[PDB]
Design a protein around this ligand. Structure first.
Ligand SMILES: *[C@@H]1O[C@H](CO)[C@@H](O)[C@H](O)[C@H]1NC(C)=O
Ligand SMILES: *[C@@H]1O[C@H](CO)[C@@H](O)[C@H](O)[C@H]1NC(C)=O
Ligand SMILES: *[C@@H]1O[C@H](CO)[C@@H](O)[C@H](O)[C@H]1NC(C)=O
Lengths: 881, 92, 166, 100, 273, 133, 44, 191
């Protein structure tokens, strides 16, 4: 098992910055991560994840040939990694800034010193150590938007600034002084920025285009007065309608000046390749059908990679090289590839170059993918990496599909089996297996990418992309049918919100092959609020999956006659409960013969001293075996199940440790009566809760002893069995009795869940996720509240039951546990930016030296038949004495 | 050895019935009990009971004097461990 | 003293059928013409001997034949002498005939005679070889005698088949 | 009768025990195959015991009282030691077939 | 085929020495069916020998004894078979020594001392046989095969007073066989005496009761009845009831011979008294 | 102390025509709750029993100083009017919600000619939240 | 007419001297059916 | 209802049966190979034989005459002349090898107090006892085959006997058999 069925994949996310150039590259992604991927196959060397939230946000990557350089926490920090083993070499912190830009400079030929621009001052540090060298200030520093920087290596360092629509100001500094050399100030109130518009082509240059007049404002920045001008009208180079165009210069060595030639970006699909002489432009080439382009440079040569649509159409994009100084296309080095999906656009490109020429490409396509392309004619993708899985939302696990005359039939069958025995001695080729453990996984993702995996050596078998999906939305996953009504296939469903319009969408498909089914859903006109499954199957096996409007009306997807009849029959045995966290109000509605809802209960909370956090309900896919807990003295003690129960948890708005508290509420979804309303004082901590068949558990933080704790609840009615066959919640006056206790836990916590295995026989465990990535299994029966075994003195930590011994997980945003067919194993899954899968053995696998068996068998048999003939003989020779 | 063969035959028929029931159960689980298997097992049971009755043994009377109805004096006189050979058989 | 073929024949046949134990027989004729093998065994017991005496006496009085001799044959090959039993037997037989003959086969023929004296001796052919040939023809297995009659009535103490055989 | 052999007694008891225990095992199996619970299989054991008693009666013929002074053991016989065998063979074949 | 092994175990089951059929039917099995018998052979080598010896042959004897030595070299039972053939060829002191060895080294070996008695019985000395036998019995009181031969010996010595003791002891350990009873009657009638004769008639009838088919004791009953009914020492009641007994026995014997299908001779005997 | 209304509503169409059945009086200082009602005249009783024929509902409602709840008729009418009301609140003192349940059980069926149901044999009791260790 | 009335004439112990409850059924209980259904949650 | 593997059936059920059967057979044969002789001498043999003689005489001294009975009784009771006048390891191993399974089922319902013995290894404490362990299979087959094997295979006593012979009668029991036979008829038609 440790090497048979448990696997770990780990990801880093969607790139922001990166840098190529022996057999390693570097990235830096949205999720505050650094990595050193292998340039021959997808694999990692050193993740150095620091912090999920903003305070570890990267702002500029920059390497040095063997040393990386980094900036985190909104301009504060500056580290220096190694690029080989992630071994940090130095680290410092800086003063508050907006971090307008970053650079890298030298004295005359060197790379000793580096620059920074925080919009308030300017710095110069050493590199090997990190000890600062000098700092100084900007002239005015509050009104001229000091957005950029430039060196040409030797001597000095410039610094620009411009407000949207008044004028530009220019500066120049010299090392070892920090003094402001002459600062020019010229008027150009038509530009609105200079960050993504302009750039220095060769060794003192500013250049920016004015679509008005379709002209270029230019400046030999060393010595010139009033930004001499060149119109882009001599040539047929019209701009775009509302496109902000810009420049793309190059500087493969920061100490030697930038190359004259440069790209220019006119319109979404219009690029040009200009070259700058002393005062005159020399144009080489223009491309009207380009999506993306990049520069790159070898020791001395310099190239330009370009992408093109061939005939957009089957996404068959071509890639080519052109030489920068000249324009020449190179006969060889023409790649043609194509994607798998229908709407999927690259939006990114990086280049690696040899000196044989040849090259390799890196492509970060829209739907969170990474391709590494090589020039050869065989397998053209050298590796493909799927980064969308770095943020999973919800998932599910589905089962795989299935494959006297009586006496004569028996004879025939037996003969067939005899013949068989004697003779003996991918998506389309598999089916479920006995005591099933395959349990195909279906996961959904926030970038809009549906997957499918085997759960054993996880292999992506199918994929799907659904567009127009925001970063912050809300999903819910519902499984309708599994392998019945043979002319009918399986099908699952998916409900999506948009978070801005309240709109909703219903996408239905088949989990096995990945195709949208033949039928269409009803078009969701109004914002939908909630959903339930209603496990009553129509003529077609489909569960109805009712939905609730914002007009408090109903809609069912399989709105057929039979289903509506069933509803017109059994409407009043169905109830919805809704919640509003802003003001803290809950409501409960019902059905009618026709499809309307008439308010049934309501309940509020003061939102200034209590704030709902989360809501829990029992899983409908559970079975409970024992209705009682037999005491030590031949005494039964029945337990209250109340399927329709639900738990609510709250905490205050005052965050002082003096009077901060957590609130608990237990409620019945149908009526609206409280079974229990509890309060735990001197606690603030974020909560983590579980709600089983009849027990409840939550974790919290004690600010008077500054340490973590649990609290556990159990519910028993008594010694009698009120109406032991029907359990209508409209008829129970007898509110049960509560037992609870508060143990302690010595550490922090992350997501928690409980095991499960159908028929609920075996012991039930709790899976805990620590911050270090350790998972931990805990037996429920240890937490029993019928303990005098005192009030626990540091209930133990045991590092001998950790599932993930060294297969750690990073963040652990959640956990999933699903049932087997074997009743002693549960299938586990952990997301959290690096996936995990395994099995558990709560009862030691009690339902499953081999040769030694037959060895002792035949040894005994022969010893028997050898001892017989000895007994006979000895008896006979007794007779004769 | 007729009866023993009969017994073996019936018993083997019963075991075949068991095998058929096992395969039938596997097939039905993949998707209560037929007639033929039942008649077969009962056939084997009864035809084994009859034979094992006939073959176990034969009853013996418990009145001893019935055994010695025909026990002539001459057989009961000659005591072997006092045999002695000086007689006319020598002269044969 | 003249002994008939069948007399000596049945005599030695009986002597050979039950050799391990002594035997006796009763002769009826002095020209002996018939013998009776009656007993085989202990012979020191009166009642069966007495009913045999009475029955044979009555049957030969029906046929008006007399009892003409006794014979005894021991199992000890070297013993050829009379004990009390043969003495009394021949005493009563002589009382009835006063010319009776006592016989003891050497087995390796010692006919006696009593005239006021303890059964002294008397003056001592083809029939010998006749009987020998019969014996070597293995026919003594179908000879019935009084004891067999008392066991199975279905036998016959006249032994007619062996008589006609010769 | 007055004078008893006291050996043929043991022979007859032994053959009875043989037949009884064996048919008990056989019934346990033939029941464990087509598994049936509680009342039905007790009915089965008892009906089979009765069949055995009847067959032995047939075998004797007029009860041949020289063999048996009383018809009691024909019916009762050794009936407890057959129960254990019966349940054991229920177990065996129910297990093998009607479970897995 | 199996007939012959069972008919050669029959003659071992009822001590029926008929030793011409034994050899004739055995020699075949012992020569050319050794395999078939399957280790039921080491007794056919001892039944055949101890009877083929009495036939006189003396060539198969050693053919058996040597194999017996082969499989069972060290023993004390085959020592007996070596000490028997010795006394067959008139070697008695060698036999006594051969016995004395095992006896001196392993008492509770009755067979040996039994054969020692057999030697004396052979020679002729009966008094000494009796003494030795009783001295043995003292140690091992109860051996029916002894008692019966002891009574037969007391008979052969013409003493009909102490034998009845031995038979009484013998009919106390298995009183469901007619033979012992009718022989006790036969020896106590021949003993003479009124008390003896009434005891005799009683045990006669008690014997006949069991089998209801013995003829000897029936004739004995008749003869004893006639004897009392012509004995001038008994009450008239005895005489008349014994006459009735004799008449009823006569009628029953008439029934017997009727069932059979001479008659006249036996009827004349019957009406004699 | 304060007062608080208590509207009680029941019809055939499970609709809302909410009317009064009296008030509650709450003393905050020590903490005590009491009721003051009016009785049910004929038409109210007929309405209640016919609603009961269809297994309709009895609804109770009070304001936040709103909040509601419901309980069937079948479990009440045959109970000779033994209801139990609770008023759940927060730590500092704020109405949170209501809870109404009838004693005992429901739907055995025995009607009493509706002349026991003129005293509202009710019980009322409230609770702050049970603290824990 | 008695023709043949014949008269002929340490054995240890021989001398001629004419001397004179709930839980049981608990295990069998069937889980009761539920009647009401209640679904929803936290208002998407 | 627990869907189970067949490898369980074969390699768990059958070895138990086979092993207990054959080891019981082997124990029988070795016990036959162990019994030595305890013959000591002729003295106690003689004493035992004469004791059995006395017991017999006591019980069936009603088929012989009066006087002989009396001679023997007096001799045995004559003053001063009477001869009375002077599993563990195998179980451990097998349980050690099959430590925790669920083998099979019994078709009739058991109460819960039967549970701790049938399973004896398993910490489930929720199953109806009708589901059995492996070791219990061993302990049960022990009994089944202990019932099938039968198919396939001093001066004190002296004085007790003397005293028990004191209180004894003759009870000839031989005084009417004559008429009993003579009563009705004789019976023989089977020759
Ligand atoms: C779409 O892409 C596939 C790549 O496998 C190619 O075979 C196919 O021809 C493309 N479609 C068209 C219309 O060419
Ligand atoms: C439970 O509810 C059913 C519903 O029909 C009812 O028949 C039964 O009587 C109830 N149980 C009790 C104990 O009243
Ligand atoms: C009032 O409440 C009590 C509470 O115990 C209950 O027993 C009784 O039935 C109710 N009704 C009347 C009229 O007392």
């Amino acid at each position: 098992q440790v090497g048979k069925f448990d696997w770990r994949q780990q990801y880093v996310g969607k790139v922001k910055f990166a840098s190529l150039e022996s057999k390693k590259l570097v990235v830096a992604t949205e999720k505050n991560v650094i990595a050193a991927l292998n340039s021959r196959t997808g694999e990692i060397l050193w993740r150095h994840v620091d912090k999920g939230t903003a305070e570890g946000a990267v702002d500029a990557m920059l390497l040095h040939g063997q040393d990386v350089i980094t900036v985190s926490n909104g301009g504060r920090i500056m580290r220096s990694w190694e690029t080989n083993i992630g071994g940090l070499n130095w680290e410092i912190t800086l003063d508050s800034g907006s971090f307008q830009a970053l650079g890298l400079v030298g004295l005359q030929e060197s790379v000793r010193y580096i620059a920074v621009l925080k919009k308030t001052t300017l710095a110069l540090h050493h590199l090997s150590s990190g000890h600062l060298k000098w700092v100084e200030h900007l002239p005015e520093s509050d009104s001229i938007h000091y957005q950029m920087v430039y060196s040409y290596g030797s001597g000095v360092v410039w610094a620009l600034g411009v407000v949207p629509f008044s004028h530009v100001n220019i500066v120049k500094f010299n090392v070892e002084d920090g003094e402001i050399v002459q600062q020019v100030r010229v008027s150009t109130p038509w530009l609105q920025h200079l960050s993504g518009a302009c750039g220095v082509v060769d060794e003192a240059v500013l250049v920016c285009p004015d679509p008005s007049s379709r002209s270029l404002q230019t400046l030999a920045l060393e010595t010139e007065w009033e930004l001499r001008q060149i119109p882009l009208q001599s040539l047929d180079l019209e701009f775009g309608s509302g496109f902000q165009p810009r420049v793309l210069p190059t500087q493969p060595n920061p100490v030697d000046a930038s190359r004259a030639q440069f790209f220019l970006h006119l319109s979404p699909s219009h690029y040009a390749l200009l070259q700058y002489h002393y005062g005159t432009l020399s144009l080489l080439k223009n491309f009207p059908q380009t999506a993306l382009v990049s520069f790159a440079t070898t020791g001395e040569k310099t190239v330009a990679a370009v992408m093109a649509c061939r005939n957009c159409f089957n996404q068959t994009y071509t890639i080519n090289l052109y030489l920068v100084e000249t324009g020449r296309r190179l006969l060889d080095t023409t790649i043609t590839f194509s994607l798998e999906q229908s709407g999927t656009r690259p939006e990114r490109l990086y280049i690696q170059v040899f000196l044989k020429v040849g090259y390799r490409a890196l492509v970060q396509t829209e739907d969170h993918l990474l391709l590494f392309l090589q020039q050869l004619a065989g397998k053209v993708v050298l590796w493909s990496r799927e980064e969308s899985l770095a943020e999973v939302v919800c998932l599910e696990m589905v089962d795989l599909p299935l494959t006297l005359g009586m006496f004569l039939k028996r004879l025939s069958s037996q003969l067939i089996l005899l013949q068989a025995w004697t003779s003996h001695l991918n998506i389309d080729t598999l089916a479920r297996d006995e005591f099933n453990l395959q349990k195909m996984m279906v996961m959904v993702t926030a970038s809009g990418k549906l997957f499918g995996i085997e759960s054993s050596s996880g292999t992506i078998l199918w994929k799907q992309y659904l567009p127009n999906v925001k970063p912050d939305s809300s999903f819910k996953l519902m499984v309708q049918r599994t392998t019945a009504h043979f002319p009918h296939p399986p099908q699952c469903t998916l409900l999506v919100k948009d978070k801005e319009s309240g709109m909703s969408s219903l996408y239905v498909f088949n989990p096995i092959f990945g195709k949208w089914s033949q039928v269409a859903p009803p078009v969701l006109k109004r914002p939908i609020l909630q959903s339930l499954l209603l496990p009553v199957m129509d003529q077609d096996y489909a569960k109805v999956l009712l939905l609730i409007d914002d007009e408090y009306k109903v809609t069912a997807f399989p709105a057929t006659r039979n289903v509506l009849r069933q509803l017109h029959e059994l409407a009043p045995s169905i109830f919805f409960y809704l919640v509003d966290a802003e003001q803290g109000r809950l409501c409960g509605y019902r059905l009618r013969k026709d499809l309307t809802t008439e308010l049934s209960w309501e309940l509020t909370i003061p939102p200034e001293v209590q704030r709902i956090v989360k809501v829990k309900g029992k899983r409908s896919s559970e079975h409970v075996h024992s209705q009682g807990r037999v005491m030590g003295d031949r005494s039964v003690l029945y337990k209250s199940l109340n399927p329709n129960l639900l738990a609510v948890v709250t905490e205050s708005t005052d965050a002082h440790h003096e009077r901060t508290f957590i609130g608990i509420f237990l409620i019945d979804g149908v009526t609206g009566r409280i079974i229990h309303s509890s309060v735990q004082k001197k606690a603030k901590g974020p909560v983590h809760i579980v709600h089983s068949e009849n027990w409840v558990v939550y974790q919290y933080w004690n600010t008077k002893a500054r340490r973590n704790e649990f609290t556990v609840l159990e519910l028993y009615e008594g010694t009698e069995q009120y109406n032991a066959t029907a359990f209508s919640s409209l008829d129970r006056p007898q509110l049960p009795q509560v037992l609870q206790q508060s143990y302690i836990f010595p550490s922090s916590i992350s997501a928690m869940e409980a095991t499960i295995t159908e028929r609920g026989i075996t012991s039930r465990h709790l899976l805990i996720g620590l911050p270090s990535g350790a998972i931990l299994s805990l037996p429920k029966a240890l937490l029993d509240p019928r303990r005098p075994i005192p009030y626990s003195p540091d209930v133990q930590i045991h590092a001998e039951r950790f599932i993930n011994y060294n297969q750690t997980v990073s963040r652990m945003r959640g956990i999933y546990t699903a049932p087997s067919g074997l009743e002693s194993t549960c299938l586990v899954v952990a997301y959290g930016l690096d996936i995990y899968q395994t099995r558990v053995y709560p009862s030691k696998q009690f339902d499953v030296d081999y040769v030694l068996i037959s060895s002792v068998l035949f040894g005994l048999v022969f010893a028997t038949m050898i001892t017989k003939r000895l007994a006979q003989v000895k008896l006979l020779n007794r007779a004769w004495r | 050895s007729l009866w023993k063969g009969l017994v073996g035959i019936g018993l083997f028929a019963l075991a075949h019935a068991a095998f058929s029931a096992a395969q039938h159960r596997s097939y039905m689980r993949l998707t209560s009990l037929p007639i033929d298997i039942v008649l077969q097992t009962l056939l084997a049971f009864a035809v084994t009971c009859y034979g094992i009755v006939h073959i176990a043994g034969e009853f013996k009377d418990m009145d001893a004097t019935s055994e010695l109805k025909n026990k002539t004096f001459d057989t009961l006189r000659n005591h072997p461990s006092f045999y002695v050979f000086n007689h006319r058989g020598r002269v044969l | 003293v003249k002994l008939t073929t069948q007399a000596y024949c049945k005599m030695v046949l009986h002597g050979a059928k039950y050799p391990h134990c002594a035997v006796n027989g009763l002769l009826v004729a002095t020209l002996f013409v018939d013998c009776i093998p009656l007993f085989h065994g202990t012979l020191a017991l009166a009642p069966m001997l007495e009913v045999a005496l009475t029955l044979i006496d009555s049957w030969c009085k029906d046929h008006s034949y007399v009892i003409a001799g006794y014979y005894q044959a021991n199992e000890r090959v070297k013993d050829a002498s009379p004990n009390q039993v043969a003495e009394k037997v021949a005493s009563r037989i002589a009382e009835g005939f006063s010319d009776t003959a006592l016989i003891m086969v050497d087995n390796t023929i010692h006919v006696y005679e009593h005239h006021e004296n303890r059964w002294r001796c008397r003056d001592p052919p083809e029939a010998q070889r006749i009987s020998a040939s019969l014996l070597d023809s293995r026919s003594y297995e179908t000879l019935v005698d009084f004891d067999n009659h008392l066991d199975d009535i279905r036998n016959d103490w006249t032994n007619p088949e062996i008589n006609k055989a010769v | 009768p007055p004078f008893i052999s006291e050996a043929a007694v043991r022979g007859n008891a032994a053959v009875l025990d043989y037949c009884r225990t064996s048919v008990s095992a056989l019934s346990g199996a033939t029941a464990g195959i087509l598994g049936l619970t509680g009342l039905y299989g007790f009915i089965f054991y008892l009906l089979a015991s009765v069949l055995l008693s009847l067959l032995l009666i047939l075998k004797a013929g007029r009860r041949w009282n020289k063999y048996f002074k009383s018809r009691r053991p024909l019916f009762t016989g050794g009936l407890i030691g057959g129960l254990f065998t019966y349940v054991l063979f229920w177990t065996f074949l129910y297990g093998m077939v009607h479970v897995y | 085929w199996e007939e012959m092994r069972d008919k050669m175990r029959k003659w071992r089951e009822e001590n029926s020495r008929n030793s011409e059929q034994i050899v004739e039917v055995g020699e075949e099995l012992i020569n050319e069916y050794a395999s078939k018998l399957g280790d039921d052979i080491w007794i056919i080598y001892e039944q055949v020998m101890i009877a083929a010896l009495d036939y006189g042959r003396d060539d198969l004897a050693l053919f058996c004894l040597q194999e017996l030595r082969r499989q069972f070299p060290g023993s004390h039972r085959v020592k007996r078979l070596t000490g028997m053939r010795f006394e067959a060829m008139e070697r008695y002191d060698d036999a006594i020594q051969l016995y004395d060895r095992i006896l001196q080294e392993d008492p509770t070996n009755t067979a040996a001392r039994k054969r020692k008695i057999a030697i004396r019985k052979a020679q002729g000395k009966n008094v000494e046989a009796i003494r030795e036998l009783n001295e043995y019995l003292e140690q091992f009181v109860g051996d029916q095969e002894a008692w019966h031969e002891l009574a037969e010996l007391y008979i052969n010595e013409h003493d009909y007073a102490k034998a009845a003791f031995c038979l009484e002891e013998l009919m106390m350990t298995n009183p469901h066989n007619h033979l012992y009873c009718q022989q006790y009657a036969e020896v106590k009638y021949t003993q003479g005496g009124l008390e003896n004769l009434e005891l005799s008639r009683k045990y006669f009838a008690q014997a006949l009761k069991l089998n209801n088919r013995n003829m000897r004791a029936l004739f004995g009953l008749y003869m004893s009845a006639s004897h009392i009914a012509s004995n001038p020492k008994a009450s008239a009641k005895t005489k008349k009831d014994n006459m009735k007994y004799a008449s009823w026995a006569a009628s029953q014997i008439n029934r017997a011979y009727q069932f059979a299908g001479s008659l006249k001779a036996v009827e004349d005997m019957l009406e004699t008294l | 102390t304060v007062g608080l209304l208590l509207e009680h509503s029941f019809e055939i169409d499970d609709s809302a025509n909410f009317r009064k059945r009296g008030s509650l009086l709450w003393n905050q200082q020590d903490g005590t709750l009491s009721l003051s009602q009016r009785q049910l005249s004929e038409e109210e009783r007929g309405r209640l029993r016919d609603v009961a024929a269809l297994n309709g509902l009895y609804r109770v409602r009070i304001p936040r100083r709103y909040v509601s709840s419901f309980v069937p008729a079948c479990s009440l009418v045959e109970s000779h009017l033994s209801d139990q009301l609770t008023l759940h609140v927060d730590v500092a003192g704020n109405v949170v919600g209501v809870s109404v349940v009838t004693h005992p059980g429901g739907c055995r069926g025995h009607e009493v000619e509706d002349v026991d149901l003129e005293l509202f044999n009710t019980s009322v009791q409230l609770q702050p939240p049970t603290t824990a260790p | 007419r008695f023709k043949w009335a014949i008269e002929l004439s340490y054995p240890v112990g021989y001398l001629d001297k004419q001397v004179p409850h709930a839980s049981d059924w608990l295990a069998f209980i069937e889980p009761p059916e539920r009647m009401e259904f209640s679904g929803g949650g936290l208002l998407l | 209802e627990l869907l189970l593997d067949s490898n369980i059936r074969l390699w768990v059920v059958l070895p138990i049966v086979i092993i207990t059967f054959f080891v019981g057979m082997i124990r029988h044969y070795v016990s036959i190979l162990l019994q030595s002789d305890k013959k000591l001498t002729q003295e106690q043999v003689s004493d035992s034989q004469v004791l059995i003689r006395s017991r017999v005489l006591r019980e069936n001294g009603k088929y012989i005459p009066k006087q002989s009975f009396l001679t023997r009784k007096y001799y045995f009771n004559n003053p001063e002349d009477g001869f009375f006048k002077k599993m563990i390891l195998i179980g451990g191993w097998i349980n050690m090898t099959f430590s925790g399974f669920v083998t099979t089922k019994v078709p009739f319902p058991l109460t819960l107090r039967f549970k701790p013995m049938l399973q004896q290894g398993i910490e489930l404490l929720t199953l109806d006892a009708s589901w059995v362990s492996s070791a219990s299979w061993y302990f049960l087959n022990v009994f089944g085959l202990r019932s099938i094997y039968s198919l396939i295979l001093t001066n004190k006593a002296f004085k007790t006997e003397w005293e028990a012979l004191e209180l004894t009668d003759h009870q000839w029991a031989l005084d009417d058999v004559e008429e009993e036979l003579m009563a009705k008829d004789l019976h023989f038609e089977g020759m």
